[PDB]
Design a protein around this ligand. Sequence first.
Ligand SMILES: COC(=O)c1c(O)cc(O)c(Cl)c1CCc1ccccc1Cc1ccccc1
Length: 214
Amino acid sequence: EKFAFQAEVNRMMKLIINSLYKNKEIFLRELISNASDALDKIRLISLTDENALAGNEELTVKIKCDKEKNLLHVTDTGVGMTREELVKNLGTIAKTSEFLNKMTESTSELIGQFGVGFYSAFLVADKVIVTSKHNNDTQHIWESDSNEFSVIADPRGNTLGRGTTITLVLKEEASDYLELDTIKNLVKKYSQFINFPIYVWSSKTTVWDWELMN
Ligand SMILES: COC(=O)c1c(O)cc(O)c(Cl)c1CCc1ccccc1Cc1ccccc1
């Protein structure tokens, strides 16, 4: 159930952490961007398939601060990932070569062009948990502290309907990202060219609910 990252992913994770240690907020730009791509990908599957949206009828992004448990959740209802997509999409690249030399040679711009912005999560996270439910497979969980990862069947069953949650066990330097004021400012900033509604679980004067940001 446990796996090793491949060499280039280790190299790029290190490259990412030492380039963007100053612009740490980009991690949340890249999680929202990756969520939009996933929703896009299911919207197009649904063009040639009316069962595509069966698992869950909406196309959203819901973001959650849980500051007692030191966690940040970015859940989308996009195309999701089968168990094998968790293993190769997240532990592999292949589909790079010169990128490792063209990134060493502003790389904040260029991380998103190769779609590799997921690893920017380790800038702020000690653990990343990816819970994903794909129409062609059961819900699975991917877990890593960057020194390895594992995928396991989710014992809670299919909670997502379809889609993906990124869960970040935040570092102590990233405790700032647990206050709604900061989070909603960074989400508002990075959600404007996103074609899906993006919500944060927020507080109003007191009850909790999804608050729309775009
Ligand atoms: C299917 O995507 C997710 O579930 C997902 C997601 O829904 C949110 C995320 O933050 C991330 Cl990181 C993923 C993983 C996706 C991924 C990460 C690294 C390399 C490849 C891919 C595949 C891909 C292809 C087209 C459009 C979106 C995603």
